[PDB]
């Protein structure tokens, strides 16, 4: 007996990006994919000859927008008639169809028109995450913990389980994303006594605030609030609009109707935005942006902060609402935890810190990786099968 047990994995199945971890040697290792990325795009692309997942899918999205699927998490476990589904559909270049009041994404794939349920798309992203972990560990992986937003209902939770089952994974448990982040910091291991934790999660296109109470390791969701369409992509959008205007001023030319030029500008803006989190200024250099014209410029952190100022400030309204719902005062919150890559922005950090009167923020665990980190800690706990000693 007792053949060595394979490690279990923790998976953050994100709306835009996914992340996979494993707890081994008393620590969590976040596993990079073969392109060296510690997070993988939650994208699936279909061609006449291939099914591409992750980076390979995201990198060819520009010329194949109708057959490159993303945001399947926004559809999972929902009815076609759902108001959220009907509004979201207007922004996606891929076709969403009605099959018995259940949404399906329809594409061209290997010579035919094919339709997939959201949980089938998410199963393909989970298959990639499983492979990434198997490439590192050097053996097949069976068991996994998968996370969902705290506001997901039974239907959304069940459809996530089905996605794992289709991917060949045994789903140990479905756990809330905010709870997973708390586990990553060991906020459930402080012993006896009530502890109030606020999770501030600002991602690529969504913003969630969660208030939890932890008592003797037991978690309770006290409040959930947020902005459904607020994130990093809105900051990229303000920089795009600023530079479109700057090009018009300097060259008397409007670039906005050339999809390639706008796309190249946005990619450069997102990269400059990241630089501005560690540097006071950033340069933006694009060769032959429009009509053979090179675009060599810069932006200060102050100007970027001014451009996105209203958006950054608006992150505090869901913080006040969640506190109102949880029936708590700011002082009462013991721990503040930052999740999502956009929380690296100094101005965002400052606004939250000042709102909580100079309190330290838990941000030592990479914000992009904290949810998968916590999922990996819980997965290792779940597969334990100790028989009590005499
Ligand atoms: N990993 C990083 O250093 C960063 C990722 N984002 C954004 O976080 C979101 C999820 O990756 C996207 O909108 C990114 O642009 C960032 N935004 C600002 N500063 C940063 N340093 C990052």
Curated annotation (Swiss-Prot):
Component of the CatSper complex. Identified in a IGF2BP1-dependent mRNP granule complex containing untranslated mRNAs. Interacts with CHCHD3, DNAJC7, IRAK1BP1, PPP5C and TSC2. Interacts with TERT; the interaction occurs in the absence of the RNA component, TERC, and dissociates once the TERT complex has formed. Interacts with TRIM5 (via B30.2/SPRY domain). Interacts with METTL21A. Interacts with DNAAF2. Interacts with PRKN. Interacts with FOXP3. Interacts with NOD2; the interaction enhances NOD2 stability. Interacts with DNAJC9 (via J domain). The N-terminal nucleotide binding domain (NBD) (also known as the ATPase domain) is responsible for binding and hydrolyzing ATP. The C-terminal substrate-binding domain (SBD) (also known as peptide-binding domain) binds to the client/substrate proteins. The two domains are allosterically coupled so that, when ATP is bound to the NBD, the SBD binds relatively weakly to clients. When ADP is bound in the NBD, a conformational change enhances the affinity of the SBD for client proteins. It comes from Homo sapiens. Belongs to the heat shock protein 70 family. This is Heat shock 70 kDa protein 1A. The modification N-acetylalanine is found at residue 4. GO terms for cellular component: aggresome; blood microparticle; centriole; centrosome; cytoplasm; cytosol; endoplasmic reticulum; extracellular exosome. The keyword Cell membrane does not apply. Residues 4-382 are annotated as: Nucleotide-binding domain (NBD).
